[PDB]
Each structure stands twice: as C-alpha cells, then as structure tokens.
C-alpha cells in the first residue's frame, strides 16, 4: 500500500524531514514517489512546515495512507479542513 | 512508439522468416567522422510475401520466437540485388584470412 510518511534528511541531532509519498516497502530514506513537503521539528526557521495541500489531497484520493505523524502535520496545514 | 527500421532482405532460405539488414549512420563519439554500422534483424513474414533484394520497413513486435522480435510492415522498394551482392561479397571474403 502506498503511504504518506516522513524521511529524515537532517544531520546528527539536527533532523529535517521530507513529507513524502512512497510505497511502504521502500526504505524510509530510500526512493520515493513525490516530495510533498518538509518538516523541521526543532522549529529553527520561521517557515518550518510546508505542504502543498492540493497535492496531498490528490494522494489521499488514490489511497495513500498517512502516518499518525504525517496525518498530524497534514491536519496542521488543513488538508482535512472542509469548510 | 514501437521502434521501426528500414532495411534490405538478405536471406530467403528460412520458413516464414526473412533476414533484414538495416544500416545506421552516426558520427564517431570521439574522432567525429561519419561511420556506417549495420545490424541484421530476423523479421516475421507470415505470408512469405517479401523476397531477396526487397527493401522493407521493419517494426518492433511481440516476440515470434528466439531472435525474432520484428515483423515486416510494408515493401518500400522492390528488387535491388546490388545491396545483397554487397553483403554476399563481404561474407564471401571470410573464406580467406583463416590459416
């Protein structure tokens, strides 16, 4: 099943994640389908999260499954906000 | 697109099969001169239509057997044995340069 998850691209003690569409079977840092945003947990920059919701909205239509942490971040950019 | 080639039939002797010789022009990757390579393809001729010396268009197809992945599309130019005689003579030269 195709999933939406994070991929660690930061350094030692400085993590930077790439919210990413990939098959669950590939490595967590391995090849992926599409880069759909980034996440800075340490919040070091003014913009530490970006999504491109309408792209993330596409993959949820074709059956991508987000992680608990991915869904948490997607909700923060309002992927599910329906008003 | 299915790959398509244009060459000359050099072999009639098989059944339902003709050997098509497709030349190719391209400059040398370093020395830059125009060189002419060529490669024989095993084509499928279901109706035994095409003969020796015919110039035909060949097209990438679902494999018919080993070594046979192309079918004959149409006859471009019919009956020019000079292209065949060029191939035979070179093949005939290999009886020398042995011992």
């Amino acid at each position: 099943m195709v999933k939406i998850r994070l991929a660690r691209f930061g350094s030692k003690h400085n993590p930077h994640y790439r919210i990413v569409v990939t098959d669950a079977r590939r490595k967590r840092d391995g090849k992926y389908i599409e880069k759909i945003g980034y996440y800075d947990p340490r919040k070091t920059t003014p913009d530490w999260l970006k999504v491109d919701v309408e792209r993330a909205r596409y993959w949820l239509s074709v059956g991508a499954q987000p992680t608990d942490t991915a869904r948490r971040l997607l909700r923060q950019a309002g992927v599910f906000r329906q008003e | 697109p299915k790959k398509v080639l244009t060459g000359v039939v050099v072999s009639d002797k098989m059944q339902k099969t003709v050997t098509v010789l497709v030349e190719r022009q391209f400059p040398h990757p370093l020395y830059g001169k125009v060189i002419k390579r060529s490669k024989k393809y095993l084509a499928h001729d279901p109706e035994e239509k095409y003969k020796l010396g015919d110039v035909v268009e060949i097209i990438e197809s679902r494999p018919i057997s080993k070594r046979k992945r192309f079918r004959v599309l149409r006859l471009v130019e019919s009956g020019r044995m000079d292209l065949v005689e060029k191939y035979l003579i070179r093949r005939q030269n290999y009886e020398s340069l042995s011992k």
Partner: protein, 124 residues
C-alpha cells in the same frame, strides 16, 4: 595517421608497469630476513652497504636496504619493507622501516627522527 585509421584502430593507452612488486600493491609488506649482507655499489661510488634478503608475506624473496648508521638486524629477525630504490645498488628495489618489529631505531639520531624511527629525547 588518418581519421579513418583512428576509427579502425584507435590510440593505444600506454600501460604503466609497477616499479614495486610488493604484491597487493600494499603500502608496506612484512617479511623475515634470509641473509644480512654488505654489497659494493655501482661505478662512481664505493662503500659497504648493508642489505637483507627477505621472504615476504607476498610470497616474494627480494633484497631490501638497511638505512641508518648501524642496525640490529640478524639472520632470523623479522622486518617491514618500505619500498623505494637504492640508486647506486642494482636490484635493490625496497627499503626497510626502522622502528618496526625487530629492527630498532638508530641510536643517537638527533636530526631526522621520523625516518630511521627514533624517539624524542629529554633535555635536562
């Protein structure tokens, strides 16, 4: 040669033969001594040069040079071969590291102590 010639045959890269058959192309190779000798050099010079026949971990028996004013190397002592040739001695293609297993460093060596393998003394 013509362009056509180059297409037909093309240049021939010049293969470079190794000057040090210390196999596995190793930076160093250890071996046990066979003989400890003293040999006469080529024409312009004259001296007694201390060398050693060495049976190598590469499966080789070669001559090595003993640097320094004097050595403790004996017939059966084990050593590490360095590489590099003694010019005025024909056939000696490899040196010997001083400061390695059974070859001590040169005593009273005060100038070039990285080579010849000697430690740092004390000044009272």
């Amino acid at each position: 040669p013509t362009i056509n010639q180059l297409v037909r045959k093309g240049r021939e890269k010049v293969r470079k033969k190794s000057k040090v058959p210390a196999l596995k192309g190793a930076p160093f190779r250890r071996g046990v001594c066979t003989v400890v000798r003293t040999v006469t050099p080529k024409k312009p010079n004259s001296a007694l040069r201390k060398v050693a026949k060495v049976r190598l971990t590469s499966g080789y028996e070669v001559t090595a040079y003993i640097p320094g004013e004097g050595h403790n190397l004996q017939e059966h002592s084990v050593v590490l071969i360095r590489g590099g040739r003694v010019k005025d001695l024909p056939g000696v293609r490899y040196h010997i590291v001083r400061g390695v297993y059974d070859a001590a460093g040169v005593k009273d060596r005060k100038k070039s102590r990285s080579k010849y393998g000697t430690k740092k003394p004390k000044e009272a």
